[PDB]
Design an enzyme around this catalytic site. Structure first.
Site, short mmCIF file in Angstrom:
data_model
loop_
_atom_site.label_atom_id
_atom_site.label_comp_id
_atom_site.label_asym_id
_atom_site.label_seq_id
_atom_site.Cartn_x
_atom_site.Cartn_y
_atom_site.Cartn_z
N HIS A 20 130.36 98.36 20.40
CA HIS A 20 129.63 98.93 19.25
C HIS A 20 129.58 97.95 18.09
O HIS A 20 128.73 98.06 17.18
CB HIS A 20 130.24 100.28 18.83
N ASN A 68 128.72 106.32 12.45
CA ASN A 68 128.16 107.58 12.05
C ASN A 68 127.49 107.62 10.71
O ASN A 68 126.53 108.37 10.54
CB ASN A 68 129.30 108.55 11.93
N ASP A 93 124.05 97.21 18.97
CA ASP A 93 124.22 97.12 20.41
C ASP A 93 123.13 97.94 21.01
O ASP A 93 122.67 98.88 20.37
CB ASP A 93 125.56 97.67 20.84
N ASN A 114 123.81 106.39 17.25
CA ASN A 114 124.08 107.14 16.03
C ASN A 114 124.03 106.37 14.70
O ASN A 114 123.69 106.95 13.66
CB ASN A 114 125.41 107.85 16.16
#
Lengths: 190, 201, 190
Positions: A20, A68, A93, A114
Protein backbone atom coordinates in the site's frame (compact mmCIF):
# COMPACT_ATOMS: atom_id res chain seq x y z
CA UNK A 1 0.70 21.21 -15.71
CA UNK A 2 1.34 19.68 -12.23
CA UNK A 3 1.72 21.67 -8.97
CA UNK A 4 1.43 18.87 -6.32
CA UNK A 5 2.48 15.17 -6.33
CA UNK A 6 0.94 12.95 -3.64
CA UNK A 7 2.30 9.55 -2.75
CA UNK A 8 -0.33 7.44 -0.98
CA UNK A 9 0.56 5.44 2.10
CA UNK A 10 0.14 4.54 5.75
CA UNK A 11 2.68 5.92 8.19
CA UNK A 12 4.76 3.76 10.52
CA UNK A 13 7.49 1.14 10.57
CA UNK A 14 4.55 -1.22 10.65
CA UNK A 15 3.51 -0.44 7.09
CA UNK A 16 6.60 1.20 5.54
CA UNK A 17 7.43 -1.96 3.54
CA UNK A 18 3.94 -2.98 2.44
CA UNK A 19 2.31 -2.91 -0.98
CA UNK A 20 0.00 0.00 0.00
CA UNK A 21 2.95 2.30 0.39
CA UNK A 22 3.85 2.04 -3.25
CA UNK A 23 2.83 5.66 -3.84
CA UNK A 24 5.12 6.88 -1.04
CA UNK A 25 7.90 4.77 -2.45
CA UNK A 26 7.61 6.78 -5.64
CA UNK A 27 7.42 10.24 -4.13
CA UNK A 28 10.34 9.39 -1.77
CA UNK A 29 12.43 8.36 -4.71
CA UNK A 30 11.58 11.64 -6.48
CA UNK A 31 12.23 13.55 -3.31
CA UNK A 32 15.61 12.02 -2.71
CA UNK A 33 16.80 12.39 -6.34
CA UNK A 34 15.66 16.05 -6.34
CA UNK A 35 17.39 16.55 -3.00
CA UNK A 36 14.49 17.67 -0.94
CA UNK A 37 13.37 14.84 1.32
CA UNK A 38 9.92 15.14 2.93
CA UNK A 39 9.89 16.55 6.43
CA UNK A 40 6.89 16.61 8.75
CA UNK A 41 4.36 19.42 8.30
CA UNK A 42 1.35 18.96 10.61
CA UNK A 43 -0.61 21.80 8.91
CA UNK A 44 -1.20 19.37 5.98
CA UNK A 45 -1.37 16.03 7.83
CA UNK A 46 1.66 14.51 6.15
CA UNK A 47 5.25 14.86 5.22
CA UNK A 48 5.96 17.45 2.61
CA UNK A 49 8.68 19.02 0.50
CA UNK A 50 9.16 21.64 -2.25
CA UNK A 51 11.24 21.14 -5.40
CA UNK A 52 11.73 23.19 -8.50
CA UNK A 53 10.81 21.56 -11.80
CA UNK A 54 11.12 23.31 -15.14
CA UNK A 55 11.66 26.41 -13.05
CA UNK A 56 8.30 26.23 -11.25
CA UNK A 57 7.37 25.08 -7.78
CA UNK A 58 6.28 21.47 -7.45
CA UNK A 59 5.25 20.21 -4.05
CA UNK A 60 5.54 16.66 -2.71
CA UNK A 61 3.22 15.16 -0.12
CA UNK A 62 2.86 11.80 1.64
CA UNK A 63 -0.08 11.95 4.03
CA UNK A 64 0.36 10.74 7.59
CA UNK A 65 -3.43 10.33 7.83
CA UNK A 66 -3.65 6.63 7.04
CA UNK A 67 -4.94 5.40 3.70
CA UNK A 68 -8.57 5.85 4.61
CA UNK A 69 -8.27 9.58 5.24
CA UNK A 70 -5.75 10.51 2.58
CA UNK A 71 -8.36 12.98 1.32
CA UNK A 72 -7.99 15.15 4.47
CA UNK A 73 -4.30 16.01 3.66
CA UNK A 74 -4.60 16.22 -0.06
CA UNK A 75 -7.58 18.57 0.31
CA UNK A 76 -5.88 20.63 3.03
CA UNK A 77 -2.74 21.35 1.03
CA UNK A 78 -4.34 21.86 -2.38
CA UNK A 79 -6.64 24.60 -0.94
CA UNK A 80 -3.80 26.35 0.90
CA UNK A 81 -1.94 26.77 -2.38
CA UNK A 82 -5.03 27.03 -4.54
CA UNK A 83 -4.14 24.03 -6.70
CA UNK A 84 -6.83 22.47 -8.94
CA UNK A 85 -7.51 18.74 -9.06
CA UNK A 86 -6.00 18.43 -12.61
CA UNK A 87 -2.71 19.82 -11.29
CA UNK A 88 -2.54 17.09 -8.66
CA UNK A 89 -0.77 13.80 -9.44
CA UNK A 90 -1.57 10.96 -7.13
CA UNK A 91 0.65 7.88 -7.01
CA UNK A 92 -0.92 4.66 -5.72
CA UNK A 93 -0.57 0.93 -5.72
CA UNK A 94 -2.66 -0.79 -8.38
CA UNK A 95 -4.03 -4.38 -8.21
CA UNK A 96 -5.01 -4.18 -11.89
CA UNK A 97 -1.51 -3.85 -13.23
CA UNK A 98 1.31 -6.31 -12.49
CA UNK A 99 4.64 -5.74 -10.73
CA UNK A 100 7.04 -4.06 -13.11
CA UNK A 101 4.34 -1.99 -14.87
CA UNK A 102 3.23 1.57 -14.09
CA UNK A 103 0.72 3.78 -15.96
CA UNK A 104 -0.65 7.35 -15.89
CA UNK A 105 -4.36 8.32 -16.07
CA UNK A 106 -6.52 11.40 -15.52
CA UNK A 107 -9.72 10.91 -13.46
CA UNK A 108 -11.86 7.79 -13.82
CA UNK A 109 -12.69 5.08 -11.25
CA UNK A 110 -11.18 4.60 -7.81
CA UNK A 111 -10.73 0.90 -8.59
CA UNK A 112 -11.57 -0.12 -5.03
CA UNK A 113 -8.57 1.75 -3.56
CA UNK A 114 -9.82 3.50 -0.44
CA UNK A 115 -7.09 6.17 -0.50
CA UNK A 116 -8.41 7.31 -3.86
CA UNK A 117 -12.02 6.95 -2.74
CA UNK A 118 -11.39 9.47 0.08
CA UNK A 119 -9.50 11.90 -2.14
CA UNK A 120 -12.38 12.01 -4.64
CA UNK A 121 -14.74 12.71 -1.77
CA UNK A 122 -12.69 15.31 0.02
CA UNK A 123 -11.85 17.16 -3.20
CA UNK A 124 -15.51 18.19 -3.32
CA UNK A 125 -16.34 14.90 -5.05
CA UNK A 126 -14.14 15.31 -8.08
CA UNK A 127 -12.13 12.43 -9.51
CA UNK A 128 -10.36 14.61 -12.14
CA UNK A 129 -6.82 14.45 -10.87
CA UNK A 130 -3.92 12.58 -12.33
CA UNK A 131 -2.98 9.18 -11.12
CA UNK A 132 0.24 7.18 -11.39
CA UNK A 133 -0.87 3.54 -11.16
CA UNK A 134 1.99 1.46 -9.78
CA UNK A 135 1.24 -2.19 -10.49
CA UNK A 136 1.41 -4.59 -7.56
CA UNK A 137 -0.72 -7.50 -8.82
CA UNK A 138 -3.68 -9.58 -7.65
CA UNK A 139 -3.59 -12.24 -4.91
CA UNK A 140 -6.04 -14.44 -6.83
CA UNK A 141 -9.12 -14.66 -4.63
CA UNK A 142 -10.96 -11.51 -3.50
CA UNK A 143 -10.39 -12.69 0.08
CA UNK A 144 -6.60 -12.59 0.64
CA UNK A 145 -6.67 -8.90 -0.54
CA UNK A 146 -6.24 -6.95 2.67
CA UNK A 147 -3.29 -9.13 3.75
CA UNK A 148 -1.89 -8.74 0.25
CA UNK A 149 -1.89 -4.92 0.13
CA UNK A 150 -0.86 -4.79 3.77
CA UNK A 151 1.86 -7.31 3.02
CA UNK A 152 5.52 -6.98 2.08
CA UNK A 153 6.21 -8.31 -1.45
CA UNK A 154 8.85 -10.99 -2.18
CA UNK A 155 12.23 -9.87 -3.46
CA UNK A 156 11.44 -10.89 -7.05
CA UNK A 157 8.37 -8.61 -7.02
CA UNK A 158 10.12 -5.79 -5.19
CA UNK A 159 12.87 -5.87 -7.82
CA UNK A 160 10.19 -5.35 -10.45
CA UNK A 161 8.16 -2.64 -8.75
CA UNK A 162 11.37 -0.67 -8.00
CA UNK A 163 12.21 -0.70 -11.73
CA UNK A 164 8.76 0.57 -12.73
CA UNK A 165 8.98 3.23 -10.05
CA UNK A 166 12.45 4.26 -11.20
CA UNK A 167 11.35 4.66 -14.78
CA UNK A 168 8.19 6.56 -13.73
CA UNK A 169 10.38 8.87 -11.64
CA UNK A 170 12.82 9.30 -14.48
CA UNK A 171 10.01 10.34 -16.82
CA UNK A 172 8.72 12.81 -14.28
CA UNK A 173 12.02 14.67 -14.23
CA UNK A 174 11.79 14.88 -18.03
CA UNK A 175 8.30 16.38 -18.33
CA UNK A 176 9.73 19.68 -17.33
CA UNK A 177 12.08 20.26 -20.29
CA UNK A 178 11.25 20.50 -24.06
CA UNK A 179 13.36 18.49 -26.58
CA UNK A 180 15.17 21.69 -27.64
CA UNK A 181 16.16 22.57 -24.05
CA UNK A 182 17.05 18.87 -23.55
CA UNK A 183 19.46 19.07 -26.58
CA UNK A 184 20.67 22.61 -25.55
CA UNK A 185 21.91 20.77 -22.46
CA UNK A 186 23.66 17.63 -23.80
CA UNK A 187 26.05 20.10 -25.58
CA UNK A 188 26.79 21.62 -22.15
CA UNK A 189 27.01 18.33 -20.30
CA UNK A 190 30.47 17.42 -21.52
CA UNK B 1 45.75 11.25 -0.62
CA UNK B 2 48.26 14.10 -0.91
CA UNK B 3 49.12 17.63 -2.04
CA UNK B 4 47.27 20.63 -0.55
CA UNK B 5 49.36 23.69 0.26
CA UNK B 6 50.08 23.72 4.01
CA UNK B 7 47.74 25.88 6.20
CA UNK B 8 49.03 29.20 7.80
CA UNK B 9 48.07 32.91 7.79
CA UNK B 10 45.96 32.78 4.90
CA UNK B 11 46.21 29.78 3.57
CA UNK B 12 42.60 28.57 4.00
CA UNK B 13 39.47 27.36 2.16
CA UNK B 14 36.04 29.07 2.34
CA UNK B 15 34.19 27.32 -0.53
CA UNK B 16 34.25 23.67 -1.83
CA UNK B 17 32.69 23.02 -5.24
CA UNK B 18 31.83 19.57 -6.52
CA UNK B 19 31.43 19.64 -10.26
CA UNK B 20 28.60 17.81 -11.99
CA UNK B 21 25.53 17.74 -14.26
CA UNK B 22 22.09 17.78 -12.72
CA UNK B 23 19.37 15.22 -13.38
CA UNK B 24 18.73 11.50 -12.67
CA UNK B 25 20.13 11.21 -16.17
CA UNK B 26 23.66 11.99 -15.06
CA UNK B 27 23.62 11.40 -11.29
CA UNK B 28 25.52 8.14 -11.70
CA UNK B 29 28.07 9.13 -14.35
CA UNK B 30 31.79 9.69 -14.20
CA UNK B 31 31.42 13.47 -14.61
CA UNK B 32 29.62 13.80 -11.32
CA UNK B 33 32.66 12.54 -9.40
CA UNK B 34 33.04 16.00 -7.86
CA UNK B 35 29.47 16.13 -6.58
CA UNK B 36 29.93 12.58 -5.20
CA UNK B 37 32.70 14.01 -3.07
CA UNK B 38 30.93 17.14 -1.87
CA UNK B 39 27.81 15.09 -1.07
CA UNK B 40 29.90 12.72 1.00
CA UNK B 41 31.34 15.65 2.89
CA UNK B 42 28.02 17.29 3.23
CA UNK B 43 26.35 14.12 4.58
CA UNK B 44 29.17 13.29 7.03
CA UNK B 45 29.09 16.90 8.28
CA UNK B 46 25.31 16.78 8.60
CA UNK B 47 24.38 19.51 6.25
CA UNK B 48 23.10 18.09 2.99
CA UNK B 49 22.97 20.43 0.03
CA UNK B 50 19.63 22.13 -0.57
CA UNK B 51 18.53 24.11 -3.60
CA UNK B 52 19.65 27.80 -3.77
CA UNK B 53 18.73 29.41 -7.08
CA UNK B 54 20.67 32.61 -6.21
CA UNK B 55 23.90 30.63 -6.91
CA UNK B 56 22.66 28.26 -9.63
CA UNK B 57 23.18 25.02 -7.73
CA UNK B 58 22.69 23.18 -4.46
CA UNK B 59 24.47 24.62 -1.46
CA UNK B 60 25.04 24.08 2.21
CA UNK B 61 27.09 25.61 5.10
CA UNK B 62 29.31 23.56 7.41
CA UNK B 63 31.65 24.43 10.27
CA UNK B 64 35.31 23.33 9.96
CA UNK B 65 37.99 24.18 12.53
CA UNK B 66 35.37 26.68 13.81
CA UNK B 67 35.20 28.55 10.45
CA UNK B 68 32.35 28.66 7.90
CA UNK B 69 32.98 26.48 4.94
CA UNK B 70 30.40 26.46 2.15
CA UNK B 71 29.61 23.63 -0.22
CA UNK B 72 28.32 24.02 -3.72
CA UNK B 73 27.30 21.71 -6.51
CA UNK B 74 26.25 23.66 -9.58
CA UNK B 75 22.99 22.83 -11.33
CA UNK B 76 24.26 24.80 -14.40
CA UNK B 77 25.56 21.83 -16.36
CA UNK B 78 29.28 21.11 -16.62
CA UNK B 79 29.82 23.67 -19.37
CA UNK B 80 28.70 26.64 -17.35
CA UNK B 81 29.95 25.60 -13.95
CA UNK B 82 31.78 28.97 -13.89
CA UNK B 83 28.47 30.90 -13.69
CA UNK B 84 27.69 29.35 -10.27
CA UNK B 85 31.18 29.28 -8.85
CA UNK B 86 31.62 32.93 -9.80
CA UNK B 87 28.22 34.03 -8.45
CA UNK B 88 28.73 32.53 -5.03
CA UNK B 89 32.36 33.51 -4.59
CA UNK B 90 31.64 37.23 -5.20
CA UNK B 91 28.65 37.26 -2.93
CA UNK B 92 30.87 36.14 -0.07
CA UNK B 93 34.00 37.92 -1.33
CA UNK B 94 35.95 34.63 -1.55
CA UNK B 95 39.24 34.56 -3.46
CA UNK B 96 40.16 31.92 -5.97
CA UNK B 97 42.87 30.46 -3.62
CA UNK B 98 40.13 29.89 -1.05
CA UNK B 99 38.09 27.81 -3.48
CA UNK B 100 38.56 24.03 -3.72
CA UNK B 101 37.12 22.45 -6.87
CA UNK B 102 36.56 18.71 -7.00
CA UNK B 103 36.42 17.08 -10.39
CA UNK B 104 36.73 13.82 -12.29
CA UNK B 105 40.22 13.31 -13.69
CA UNK B 106 41.07 11.18 -16.79
CA UNK B 107 44.79 11.42 -15.97
CA UNK B 108 44.58 9.50 -12.70
CA UNK B 109 43.09 6.03 -12.30
CA UNK B 110 40.09 4.83 -10.24
CA UNK B 111 41.17 4.58 -6.63
CA UNK B 112 43.55 7.56 -6.71
CA UNK B 113 42.79 11.20 -5.82
CA UNK B 114 45.22 14.16 -5.62
CA UNK B 115 45.21 17.86 -4.71
CA UNK B 116 46.75 20.70 -6.75
CA UNK B 117 46.72 24.50 -6.80
CA UNK B 118 46.20 26.16 -10.22
CA UNK B 119 47.67 24.82 -13.46
CA UNK B 120 46.02 23.28 -16.52
CA UNK B 121 42.34 22.55 -17.11
CA UNK B 122 43.42 19.19 -18.58
CA UNK B 123 40.56 19.20 -21.09
CA UNK B 124 37.84 19.26 -18.44
CA UNK B 125 35.27 21.87 -19.62
CA UNK B 126 33.92 22.46 -16.11
CA UNK B 127 37.29 23.78 -15.05
CA UNK B 128 37.76 25.64 -18.37
CA UNK B 129 34.59 27.65 -17.58
CA UNK B 130 35.54 28.31 -13.98
CA UNK B 131 38.94 29.75 -14.95
CA UNK B 132 37.22 31.97 -17.48
CA UNK B 133 34.39 33.11 -15.20
CA UNK B 134 36.71 33.83 -12.27
CA UNK B 135 38.15 36.69 -14.35
CA UNK B 136 40.51 34.26 -16.12
CA UNK B 137 42.35 32.97 -13.11
CA UNK B 138 43.27 29.29 -12.68
CA UNK B 139 44.61 29.76 -9.17
CA UNK B 140 42.17 27.81 -7.11
CA UNK B 141 42.54 24.44 -5.48
CA UNK B 142 41.51 21.25 -7.20
CA UNK B 143 40.79 17.79 -5.95
CA UNK B 144 41.51 15.45 -8.88
CA UNK B 145 39.37 12.33 -8.53
CA UNK B 146 40.76 9.61 -10.75
CA UNK B 147 38.34 7.99 -13.16
CA UNK B 148 40.72 6.69 -15.89
CA UNK B 149 41.10 6.75 -19.70
CA UNK B 150 38.90 4.85 -22.15
CA UNK B 151 41.91 4.28 -24.43
CA UNK B 152 41.10 6.08 -27.68
CA UNK B 153 40.41 9.83 -27.78
CA UNK B 154 37.08 8.97 -29.37
CA UNK B 155 34.98 7.04 -26.82
CA UNK B 156 35.71 9.91 -24.29
CA UNK B 157 32.30 11.64 -24.15
CA UNK B 158 30.46 8.33 -23.66
CA UNK B 159 33.04 7.45 -21.03
CA UNK B 160 32.66 10.57 -18.86
CA UNK B 161 28.95 10.53 -19.38
CA UNK B 162 28.86 6.84 -18.55
CA UNK B 163 28.32 4.97 -15.30
CA UNK B 164 31.38 2.99 -14.23
CA UNK B 165 31.39 -0.73 -13.50
CA UNK B 166 31.10 -1.87 -9.87
CA UNK B 167 34.85 -2.73 -9.64
CA UNK B 168 35.72 0.85 -10.61
CA UNK B 169 33.01 2.46 -8.47
CA UNK B 170 34.27 0.49 -5.46
CA UNK B 171 37.67 2.03 -6.12
CA UNK B 172 36.53 5.60 -6.72
CA UNK B 173 34.43 5.52 -3.57
CA UNK B 174 37.47 4.53 -1.52
CA UNK B 175 39.56 7.38 -2.91
CA UNK B 176 36.66 9.83 -2.27
CA UNK B 177 36.24 8.58 1.30
CA UNK B 178 39.94 9.05 1.93
CA UNK B 179 39.92 12.51 0.35
CA UNK B 180 36.91 13.52 2.43
CA UNK B 181 38.53 12.14 5.61
CA UNK B 182 41.65 14.13 4.45
CA UNK B 183 40.21 17.53 3.75
CA UNK B 184 38.90 17.21 7.28
CA UNK B 185 42.38 16.91 8.66
CA UNK B 186 43.66 19.75 6.57
CA UNK B 187 41.39 22.23 8.33
CA UNK B 188 42.37 20.88 11.76
CA UNK B 189 45.75 21.67 13.35
CA UNK B 190 48.28 19.03 14.42
CA UNK B 191 47.75 19.53 18.18
CA UNK B 192 43.93 19.74 18.40
CA UNK B 193 43.66 16.71 16.12
CA UNK B 194 45.85 14.47 18.20
CA UNK B 195 44.16 15.77 21.42
CA UNK B 196 40.82 14.91 19.80
CA UNK B 197 41.67 11.33 18.98
CA UNK B 198 42.67 11.15 22.66
CA UNK B 199 39.11 12.09 23.62
CA UNK B 200 37.76 10.11 20.64
CA UNK B 201 38.26 6.88 22.55
CA UNK C 1 8.94 4.57 29.17
CA UNK C 2 11.62 6.40 27.07
CA UNK C 3 11.89 10.21 26.68
CA UNK C 4 15.42 10.61 25.15
CA UNK C 5 17.47 8.40 22.82
CA UNK C 6 21.22 9.07 22.59
CA UNK C 7 23.47 7.61 19.89
CA UNK C 8 27.11 7.80 20.91
CA UNK C 9 29.82 8.96 18.52
CA UNK C 10 32.60 11.29 17.56
CA UNK C 11 31.98 14.20 15.25
CA UNK C 12 33.76 14.78 11.99
CA UNK C 13 34.25 13.29 8.54
CA UNK C 14 37.28 11.78 10.19
CA UNK C 15 35.20 9.46 12.40
CA UNK C 16 31.75 9.32 10.77
CA UNK C 17 32.50 5.87 9.28
CA UNK C 18 34.21 4.27 12.28
CA UNK C 19 33.07 1.54 14.62
CA UNK C 20 32.62 4.01 17.51
CA UNK C 21 29.89 5.83 15.68
CA UNK C 22 27.63 2.74 15.75
CA UNK C 23 25.38 4.56 18.22
CA UNK C 24 24.99 7.55 15.89
CA UNK C 25 24.33 5.20 12.96
CA UNK C 26 21.32 3.89 14.87
CA UNK C 27 19.87 7.23 15.94
CA UNK C 28 20.41 8.67 12.46
CA UNK C 29 18.51 5.75 10.98
CA UNK C 30 15.68 6.23 13.44
CA UNK C 31 15.75 9.94 12.82
CA UNK C 32 15.63 9.47 9.03
CA UNK C 33 12.81 6.91 9.11
CA UNK C 34 10.88 9.21 11.41
CA UNK C 35 11.66 12.15 9.09
CA UNK C 36 13.24 14.46 11.57
CA UNK C 37 16.95 14.32 10.92
CA UNK C 38 19.15 15.74 13.70
CA UNK C 39 20.06 19.42 13.39
CA UNK C 40 22.75 21.31 15.37
CA UNK C 41 21.81 22.51 18.86
CA UNK C 42 24.78 24.04 20.71
CA UNK C 43 22.71 24.37 23.93
CA UNK C 44 23.10 20.55 24.30
CA UNK C 45 26.54 20.03 22.73
CA UNK C 46 25.31 17.81 19.89
CA UNK C 47 22.79 17.35 17.12
CA UNK C 48 19.25 16.91 18.26
CA UNK C 49 15.76 16.31 16.94
CA UNK C 50 12.22 15.73 18.25
CA UNK C 51 9.92 12.96 17.08
CA UNK C 52 6.52 11.73 18.20
CA UNK C 53 6.30 8.12 19.34
CA UNK C 54 3.06 6.52 20.60
CA UNK C 55 1.72 10.10 20.79
CA UNK C 56 4.46 11.27 23.23
CA UNK C 57 7.59 13.38 22.53
CA UNK C 58 10.75 11.41 22.13
CA UNK C 59 13.99 13.31 21.66
CA UNK C 60 17.07 12.21 19.73
CA UNK C 61 20.61 13.28 20.50
CA UNK C 62 24.05 12.60 19.06
CA UNK C 63 26.67 14.51 21.08
CA UNK C 64 29.29 16.55 19.25
CA UNK C 65 31.44 16.43 22.42
CA UNK C 66 33.68 13.54 21.44
CA UNK C 67 33.27 10.10 23.01
CA UNK C 68 35.11 11.02 26.16
CA UNK C 69 32.74 13.79 27.18
CA UNK C 70 29.48 12.30 25.98
CA UNK C 71 28.20 12.76 29.55
CA UNK C 72 28.33 16.56 29.24
CA UNK C 73 25.63 16.54 26.49
CA UNK C 74 23.51 13.69 27.86
CA UNK C 75 23.48 15.49 31.20
CA UNK C 76 22.75 18.99 29.84
CA UNK C 77 19.71 17.86 27.82
CA UNK C 78 18.24 15.44 30.35
CA UNK C 79 18.16 18.12 33.06
CA UNK C 80 16.64 20.70 30.73
CA UNK C 81 13.69 18.43 30.12
CA UNK C 82 13.74 16.81 33.59
CA UNK C 83 14.26 13.31 32.17
CA UNK C 84 15.27 10.48 34.51
CA UNK C 85 18.08 8.06 33.73
CA UNK C 86 15.66 5.13 33.22
CA UNK C 87 13.97 7.15 30.49
CA UNK C 88 17.21 7.53 28.58
CA UNK C 89 18.17 4.93 25.97
CA UNK C 90 21.82 4.97 24.96
CA UNK C 91 22.99 3.26 21.81
CA UNK C 92 26.67 2.28 21.64
CA UNK C 93 29.14 0.05 19.86
CA UNK C 94 29.78 -3.18 21.76
CA UNK C 95 33.05 -5.17 21.57
CA UNK C 96 31.31 -8.05 23.50
CA UNK C 97 28.75 -8.87 20.83
CA UNK C 98 29.61 -9.62 17.22
CA UNK C 99 28.59 -7.85 14.00
CA UNK C 100 24.97 -8.62 13.18
CA UNK C 101 23.83 -8.83 16.80
CA UNK C 102 22.27 -6.10 18.94
CA UNK C 103 20.85 -6.28 22.49
CA UNK C 104 19.08 -4.08 25.06
CA UNK C 105 19.96 -3.79 28.77
CA UNK C 106 19.18 -1.58 31.75
CA UNK C 107 22.12 -0.32 33.86
CA UNK C 108 25.11 -2.53 34.62
CA UNK C 109 28.78 -2.19 33.67
CA UNK C 110 30.33 0.30 31.28
CA UNK C 111 32.29 -2.56 29.69
CA UNK C 112 35.34 -0.39 28.97
CA UNK C 113 33.46 2.01 26.69
CA UNK C 114 34.53 5.51 27.70
CA UNK C 115 31.40 7.20 26.36
CA UNK C 116 29.24 5.20 28.80
CA UNK C 117 31.84 5.76 31.56
CA UNK C 118 31.38 9.56 31.28
CA UNK C 119 27.60 9.34 31.08
CA UNK C 120 27.45 7.32 34.33
CA UNK C 121 29.68 9.93 35.99
CA UNK C 122 27.94 13.02 34.58
CA UNK C 123 24.45 11.66 35.45
CA UNK C 124 25.35 12.06 39.14
CA UNK C 125 27.06 8.65 39.10
CA UNK C 126 24.09 6.56 38.03
CA UNK C 127 24.35 3.67 35.56
CA UNK C 128 20.59 3.00 35.48
CA UNK C 129 19.72 3.99 31.99
CA UNK C 130 18.89 1.77 29.05
CA UNK C 131 21.47 0.70 26.56
CA UNK C 132 21.29 -0.63 23.02
CA UNK C 133 24.42 -2.73 22.55
CA UNK C 134 25.30 -2.83 18.89
CA UNK C 135 27.78 -5.63 18.30
CA UNK C 136 31.01 -4.71 16.49
CA UNK C 137 33.35 -7.51 17.60
CA UNK C 138 36.81 -8.01 19.13
CA UNK C 139 40.10 -7.44 17.25
CA UNK C 140 41.70 -10.35 19.16
CA UNK C 141 44.50 -8.83 21.22
CA UNK C 142 43.78 -6.07 23.76
CA UNK C 143 46.33 -3.91 21.85
CA UNK C 144 44.88 -3.21 18.40
CA UNK C 145 41.67 -1.99 20.19
CA UNK C 146 41.90 1.76 19.68
CA UNK C 147 42.61 1.37 15.93
CA UNK C 148 39.73 -1.12 15.75
CA UNK C 149 37.06 1.10 17.31
CA UNK C 150 38.44 4.08 15.44
CA UNK C 151 38.55 2.09 12.23
CA UNK C 152 36.07 1.61 9.41
CA UNK C 153 34.80 -1.98 9.21
CA UNK C 154 35.01 -4.09 6.02
CA UNK C 155 31.91 -4.32 3.83
CA UNK C 156 31.07 -7.85 5.07
CA UNK C 157 30.90 -6.55 8.65
CA UNK C 158 29.13 -3.34 7.69
CA UNK C 159 26.48 -5.39 5.86
CA UNK C 160 25.92 -7.24 9.14
CA UNK C 161 25.91 -4.29 11.53
CA UNK C 162 23.42 -2.41 9.30
CA UNK C 163 21.02 -5.36 9.46
CA UNK C 164 21.15 -5.46 13.26
CA UNK C 165 20.68 -1.68 13.40
CA UNK C 166 17.74 -1.85 11.02
CA UNK C 167 16.09 -4.54 13.13
CA UNK C 168 16.80 -2.63 16.33
CA UNK C 169 15.29 0.52 14.79
CA UNK C 170 12.25 -1.37 13.45
CA UNK C 171 11.72 -2.73 16.96
CA UNK C 172 12.50 0.48 18.81
CA UNK C 173 9.83 2.40 16.86
CA UNK C 174 7.16 -0.28 17.09
CA UNK C 175 7.62 -0.94 20.87
CA UNK C 176 6.27 2.63 21.04
CA UNK C 177 2.76 2.10 19.50
CA UNK C 178 0.16 0.72 22.00
CA UNK C 179 -2.40 -1.93 21.00
CA UNK C 180 -5.29 0.52 20.92
CA UNK C 181 -3.52 2.91 18.59
CA UNK C 182 -2.20 -0.08 16.62
CA UNK C 183 -5.77 -1.50 16.25
CA UNK C 184 -7.28 1.92 15.52
CA UNK C 185 -4.83 2.35 12.66
CA UNK C 186 -5.38 -0.98 10.81
CA UNK C 187 -9.07 0.17 10.73
CA UNK C 188 -7.91 3.03 8.52
CA UNK C 189 -4.89 1.38 6.92
CA UNK C 190 -6.64 -0.39 4.04
Amino acid sequence: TIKLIVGLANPGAEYAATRHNAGAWFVDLLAERLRAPLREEAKFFGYTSRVTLGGEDVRLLVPTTFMNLSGKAVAAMASFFRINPDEILVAHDELDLPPGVAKFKLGGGHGGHNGLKDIISKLGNNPNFHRLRIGIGHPGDKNKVVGFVLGKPPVSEQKLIDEAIDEAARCTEMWFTDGLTKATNRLHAF
